[PDB]
Structures are given as C-alpha cells and as structure tokens.
Assembly symmetry: C2
C-alpha cells in the first residue's frame, strides 16, 4: 500500500521513467569560442573529416 | 522570368529560407571526454554555477 501510493499519482518527477530526466539537473549546452586551442584527440576517418 | 523559374518550384535547398540550413553542411555535435583540461574562460555568476 505505502509504495503503491508513494509511486502512483501526482508525485516528484522520477528520472527513471523519463530516460534519466532530472528537473533539478536540467541539462543544456552553451556555445563557447575556444580561447586556447585544445590538445588533440583521436577519432575515425569520417569523424575527423 | 529567369529568376522566377530559378527560385520557384523544386530546386536546391536555399539556406536563406530555412535559417541558414545547408544540407551540404548539416551541423551536429559529438560528445567528447576532455583528456587534457582546458584553459579558463570567463562567464557570469549564474553561468558558472
């Protein structure tokens, strides 16, 4: 009973039910211009191209 | 006449009509793990947090 009521109805968003979506940790990306060039990394022919 | 026919109908995708969308230069992003940490960059309080 306790767990049914705890995990049914209106409740805190569970990241396990939405592919790890944590509203507290809403993930985004910011555009930054590299000021100092980065060290090389290795990837395949198509990726480098 | 020539410009109407050139820029009407089925034609090469014009990036100016689709917010700079160039099919020849389809932009994507790849996840990379930093192997050597980058040099500092400056941003605001909320951005750093």
């Amino acid at each position: 009973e306790e767990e049914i009521l705890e995990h049914s109805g209106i409740r805190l968003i569970e990241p396990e039910l939405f592919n790890g979506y944590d509203p507290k940790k809403k993930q985004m990306i910011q555009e930054i211009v590299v000021q100092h060039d980065l060290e090389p990394f290795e990837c395949s022919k198509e990726t480098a191209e």
